[PDB]
């Protein structure tokens, strides 16, 4: 069960997202309500037990606040989300030369071409400019920036 | 090629090494290539020695 403090924090996030004044969040937004509470759910997590519709699809369903409360508790708060240790050894698959450096093109390609594919718009928005000559991107610095 | 492999004993040598343990991998190689499998088991950078 959640604390009164957790319920109020989840509510404070909720009261922004129902912005029409309905007391109800549109179902599409629920994964980004979870992201707004600092959990990092996959779109595969989002479409299953969190009950989200298609990606970027509005209108199909809406969620009351009390309905949202088990949808925080039993979902991303009931699983592994990954740590630093995951990302470092997943990135080391693409560390050809062992120096902590990956090409910016290769790192953009992993984000855009693999997994739950990122838009180029998303990839530029998360890029902190850390590209040298052909010294390329320090991937540990990238992980620490994205997990802060 | 199959008839030659039967008659020259290469197919015997493969059934022989399957009785034993044929694949032999260094402790360093096993850790360095395959860490990606088991982040839950393989902890922190204090886990040296590699055995």
What's the CA gap between A67 and A25, in Å, rounded?
10
Residue A132 is given by DSSP the state B
Q: How far is B47 from chain A (nearest CA, A)?
A: 13
Nearest CA in chain A to B41: A85
Residue with structure tokens 């509005």? A58
A:B CB pairs within 8 Å: 12
Strand ranges in chain A using DSSP code E only, listed in sequence order: 24-26, 62-64, 101-102, 137-138
- Per CB-CB distance under 8 Å, the chain B contacts of A83 are 39
- Asked if residue A145 lies in contact with residue A138, where contact means CB atoms within 8 angstroms, the answer is no
Residue A136 is given by DSSP the state B
The token duo for A77 is 């708060």
What's the CA gap between B12 and B26, in Å, rounded?
26
Beta-bridge partners for A102? A137
Q: How far is B24 from chain A (nearest CA, A)?
A: 22
Do the chains contact at B39 and A86, CB–CB below 8 Å? yes
What's the CA gap between A49 and A146, in Å, rounded?
26
CB proximity under 8 Å: B 7-26 to A: none
Start-to-end CA span in chain A (Å) = 28
Residue A97 is given by DSSP the state S
Q: Residue A91's closest CA among A126, A22, A142?
A: A142
What's the CA gap between A91 and A141, in Å, rounded?
12
The torsion angle over the Cα atoms of residues B38, B42, B43 and B45, rounded to 10 degrees, is -120
CA atoms within 13 A on the CB side of A117: 5
Experimental method: cryo-EM
The token duo for B23 is 């694949």
The token duo for B32 is 């360095």
Q: Residue A91's closest CA among A82, A79, A81, A100?
A: A100
Nearest CA in chain A to B43: A85
What's the CA gap between A3 and B44, in Å, rounded?
33
> Which residues in chain B precede a discontinuity of more than 2.5 Å between C and N?
none
Do the chains contact at B39 and A92, CB–CB below 8 Å? no
């Amino acid at each position: 069960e959640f604390s009164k403090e957790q319920q109020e924090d989840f509510k404070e996030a909720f009261l922004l997202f129902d912005r029409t004044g309905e007391c109800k969040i549109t179902l599409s937004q629920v994964g980004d309500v979870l992201r707004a509470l600092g959990t990092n759910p996959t779109n595969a997590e989002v479409k299953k037990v969190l009950g989200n519709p298609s990606n970027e699809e509005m209108n199909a369903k809406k969620i009351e606040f009390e309905q949202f409360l088990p949808m925080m508790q039993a979902i991303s708060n009931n699983k592994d989300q990954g740590g630093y240790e995951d990302f470092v050894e997943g990135l080391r698959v693409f560390d050809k030369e062992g120096n902590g450096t990956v090409m910016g093109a290769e790192l953009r390609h992993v984000l855009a071409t693999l997994g739950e594919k990122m838009k180029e718009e998303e990839v530029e928005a998360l890029l902190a400019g850390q590209e040298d000559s052909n010294g390329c991107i320090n991937y540990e610095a990238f992980v620490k920036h994205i997990m802060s | 090629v199959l008839h030659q492999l039967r008659c020259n004993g290469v197919l015997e040598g493969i059934r022989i090494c399957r009785k034993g343990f044929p694949s032999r991998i260094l402790y360093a190689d096993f850790k360095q290539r395959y860490k990606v499998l088991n982040a839950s088991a393989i902890p922190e950078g204090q886990f040296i020695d590699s055995k």
